[PDB]
Design a binder for these strands. Structure first.
Lengths: 56, 86, 102, 272
RNA sequence: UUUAUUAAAAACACAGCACUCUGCAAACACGAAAGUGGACGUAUAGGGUGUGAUGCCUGCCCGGUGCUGGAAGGUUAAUU
RNA sequence: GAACUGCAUCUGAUACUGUUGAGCUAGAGUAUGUGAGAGGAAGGUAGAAUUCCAGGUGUAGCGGUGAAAUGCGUAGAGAUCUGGAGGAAUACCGAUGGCGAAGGCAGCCUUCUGGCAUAAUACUGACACUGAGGCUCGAAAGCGUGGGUAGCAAACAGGAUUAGAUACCCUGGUAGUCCACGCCGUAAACGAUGUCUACUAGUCGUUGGGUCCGGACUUAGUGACGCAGCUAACGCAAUAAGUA
């Protein structure tokens, strides 16, 4: 429906245990919402609500 | 850029009939305002070639419209370029 | 133009965060600015250590203002030295409901 | 900027002058002026102690406020002037009390804006602050070395210093020489880069232009006889020896630095 | 510009270029030192050296002798 | 006799072309609302990783290859941990996905700015298509001036291989790659397919909209197939190399 970078709990299940964005061929999401997912995840990473990688 | 308010100001000043917004005069006046407004942007970003392409396109369209007016009503073309200073 | 700005302040300097915030609220409201939302998320465990610290104080506030006041706020965030991070975003609407994080 | 001369004369073919239309065309503020006569590079013994100095135009000394101790009194930039004594421009400051001073003009400093000196001053080009009230990473100039002595470093046209960090009572500076140094944090610096950044872009063009600035011609050592220079002598062109000064001091890499008292104020140098 | 008085030149200088030194009580120079010049300048500055507008450019060699950096080892003064 | 395909001047015709007057909306444009996008320009910033520097632990190797050797290392390397400097690129997302006239364009944020797609209404009333000369833009390399310089790396040096090895492989390594402002004007700059318009079986994907009842339809792109037609053949085939 809609997506934001503050939805950390929602963004946790689209990011892998190593911190990588899970691809659309796996999650099944549409291209538009995958694009919004990616930009929100990068913004959350900058805000340090999510990790870039699992070894900082 | 131009806003809706000043775009409607230009349209109301160069109205040919009631709420026409499609005559050569109103089109050329809107193009002239937009070009004069974008000159400021291009004085700042002169390496902007992609936006300058669109600016050149609106210059070409304004020239075509002015040629069409010159062929259509000569006095109308002369008066319009007299207001717009072209 | 509406702006959603999130501030990351040092945990040691969290005692002055209220004055920190009200300074920017007063600056915005002075110049015909509207504070459409303001919340303090509190101390939060950072996903990665910023500047050799592992917790930080998060403060979000969505406002509406002009370019000149935005530049003033940006310079204030940059030279505050207590705000260890900032994120300024441009929003089309005005956001008022409480965020899911608070 | 730089303007090329048309090659109307062979002496004009390579003149590239620095031109600043915004410099004052009038005369300097006469109260801040002193008479200043040439030395010819001669000391109180009458001996040439610095060669190649002689002639040139008469010029007054402008009294520059390098210290900037009129703290917390705003000053307005009345005008920006050319100074014959230095490569940088000088800003005439007019304080709220009416007192006028000359300072080094920053690159981003214009006529009308207000400069401030002291500790509670904005970080804007032209303001003078102690180094502890200056945030890391800003470009500064006119650095003090002793507290209260006045600006000594980074004063030439285009000068800038990087404030890298702080390690106690010392501020860590990177100089244009490529030297990382520490300076007491209670010393002052001025925000911004020094004006006239295209000083080293100019071309004198002819020998007379160098003579106008008080520079006498320079005779190579190998062009002399051995009684004059270590490089003198030879039938035809010859060098024959490692390069040296006319006093026998190597000129191709030999370091000449004695100061053992200041050795601990220097962090490092750059190697290129 | 130059060999006043047998040499005016292709010699010197030159704008330009490079290397190198110099963080300021600068390096460097005069001086026995005080005191000076550099400079009431501050690395876009100042000193030394070479080369010598400009155009196109400037290959290989660090063995020798210098210069710069390093200190594991050998040798090594007064002294004790 | 015919012909001399011609020229000139009168007369007639008005379907088409030309020149004109008026009208029209279907081509082309305008105003208004939504939408997507690595479109462009200027700043700022983040996180990994490399290199360098300074330290703690630690000790005899590291590195490299098909093997080696050059090289680095007991003056303490490599490995490991902690600080510092700096430059460049932006993993994952990522996709016959997107945007751009082409060349091209990927972290994130702000500012300035172009085009496009879309639903309806209103408006102008053929304002169009193409385009010699011309002008603009135009990968990479290269050039000029001024900065920068981590990695990579022409040249260059050494080590191998080899009959030789001015190479391929290895170890280093400078211009360059990066920035600013300008030149250059070329690429297998390619879809080896000029641009624009109309029409001509169909099937299955995908991107951005839209309208209906998870599908149905309709649009503008972007792909894979496949008739008729075309082609020397390969093949193209509504994104034609078909019919004009």
């Amino acid at each position: 429906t809609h997506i934001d970078y503050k939805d950390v709990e929602l963004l946790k299940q689209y990011i892998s245990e190593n911190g990588k964005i899970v691809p659309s061929r796996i999650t099944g999401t549409s291209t538009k919402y995958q694009r919004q997912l990616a930009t929100a995840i990068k913004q959350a990473r900058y805000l340090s609500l999510l990790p870039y990688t699992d070894n900082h | 850029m131009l806003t809706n308010s000043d775009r409607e100001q230009i349209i109301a000043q160069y109205q040919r009939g009631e709420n026409d917004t499609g005559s050569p005069e109103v089109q050329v006046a809107l193009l002239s305002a937009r070009i004069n407004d974008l000159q400021n942007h291009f004085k700042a970003h002169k390496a902007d070639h992609h936006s300058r392409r669109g600016l050149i396109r609106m210059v070409n369209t304004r020239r075509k419209l002015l040629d069409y007016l010159k062929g259509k009503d000569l006095g109308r073309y002369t008066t319009l370029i007299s207001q717009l200073g072209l | 133009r509406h702006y959603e700005v999130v501030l990351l302040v040092h945990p040691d300097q969290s005692d002055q965060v209220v004055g920190m915030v009200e300074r920017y609220i007063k600056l915005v409201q002075d110049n015909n600015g509207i504070i459409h939302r303001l919340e303090d998320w509190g101390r939060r465990q950072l996903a990665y250590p910023i500047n050799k610290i592992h917790k930080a104080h998060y403060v979000l506030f969505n406002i509406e203002t002009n370019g000149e006041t935005l530049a003033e706020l940006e310079e204030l965030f940059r030279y505050n030295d207590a705000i260890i991070r900032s994120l300024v975003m441009r929003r089309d609407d005005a956001i008022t409901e409480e965020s899911q994080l608070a | 900027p730089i303007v090329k001369a048309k090659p109307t004369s062979p002496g004009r073919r390579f003149v590239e002058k620095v031109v600043h239309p915004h410099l004052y065309k009038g005369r300097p503020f006469a109260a801040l002026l002193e008479s200043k006569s040439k030395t010819g590079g001669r000391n109180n013994n009458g001996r040439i102690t610095t060669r190649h100095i002689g002639g040139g135009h008469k010029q007054h000394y402008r009294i520059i406020d390098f210290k900037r101790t009129k703290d917390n009194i705003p000053a307005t930039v009345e005008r920006i002037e050319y100074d014959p004594n230095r490569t940088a421009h000088i800003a005439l400051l007019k304080y709220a009390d009416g007192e006028r001073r000359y300072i080094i003009a920053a690159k981003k400093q214009a006529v009308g804006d207000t400069v401030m000196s002291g500790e509670a001053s904005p970080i804007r080009p032209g303001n003078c602050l102690p180094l502890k009230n200056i945030p890391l990473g800003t470009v500064i100039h006119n650095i003090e070395l002793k507290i209260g002595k006045g600006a000594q470093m980074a004063r030439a046209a285009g000068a800038s210093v990087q404030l890298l960090g702080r390690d106690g009572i010392y501020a860590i500076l990177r100089l244009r020489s490529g030297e990382t140094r520490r300076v007491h944090v209670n010393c002052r610096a001025v925000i911004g880069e020094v004006s006239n950044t295209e000083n080293n872009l100019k071309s004198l063009g002819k020998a007379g232009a160098s003579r106008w600035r008080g520079i006498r011609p320079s005779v190579r050592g190998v062009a002399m006889n051995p009684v004059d220079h270590p490089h003198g002598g030879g039938e035809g062109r010859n060098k024959g020896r490692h390069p040296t000064s006319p006093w026998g001091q190597k000129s191709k890499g030999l370091k000449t630095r004695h100061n053992k008292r200041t050795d601990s104020m220097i962090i490092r140098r750059a190697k290129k």
